[PDB]
Amino acid sequence: LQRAVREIPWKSRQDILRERERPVYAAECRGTPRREYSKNVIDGVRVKPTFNPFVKLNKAKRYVLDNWPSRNWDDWSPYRCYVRGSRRRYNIPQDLLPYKDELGEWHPPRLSARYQADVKKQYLMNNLPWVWQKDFYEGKMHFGDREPLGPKVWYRKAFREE
Amino acid sequence: IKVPRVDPFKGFRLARFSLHEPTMPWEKFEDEAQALGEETQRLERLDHEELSDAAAYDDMSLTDMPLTERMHRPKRLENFKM
């Protein structure tokens, strides 16, 4: 589990993107499952966001799946994606990046971070890691690994005990 | 409604949130070359031997077997039937 929750990606982006899996849906049992869906579970810890074959679609989710081209899995491509309910198809990653304007100064990306999040969600549902992150191949000094100082009152009490 | 009066785990401490460095208790107190060289060469020449089969790597002498292995390996091999 310690290794899995710290792995760093190493494969090429093209090879990773060649591994897309079309979503496949299967209903849950009538009662309750005997355990949790354990595709990416080690020692009871979910170490990766997993697409859920056993979703119970409500009206809103079904509307999104039925109407929005971005959820039409039969015409889905990682390099050309629709965002949320858009009808325009955006080039990935070229439209995720800031660009220079006619004055040569930086301009916000044609796709905002909010829509890039939807593209990431599409990737995850297609079982692809988000390879277009700025530092995809770099390990991170996770916030939870920092050594914490306990309450200062504890140290004051130790000083007074001394 | 009713609980035991004494909770025997109150006062639990997770780690050492100490004022001072975590110093180890030891810190307050701080011809034959021919045999050594012959042993080093004897060990070096072994690493360079061509193996007949890939599974014969650990076919070494008892004296050079690590002691714990010399005590436990017979039991492991007596229990691991082949």
Binding site: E147, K152 | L19
Partner: peptide, 21 residues
């Protein structure tokens, strides 16, 4: 009463030194 403890500060600095060059 020093705060934060000097050993904690030095340990944090040493942990940061290799990662940050």
């Amino acid at each position: 009463f020093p705060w934060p403890p000097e050993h904690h500060t030095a340990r944090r600095k040493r942990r940061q030194a290799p990662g940050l060059g």
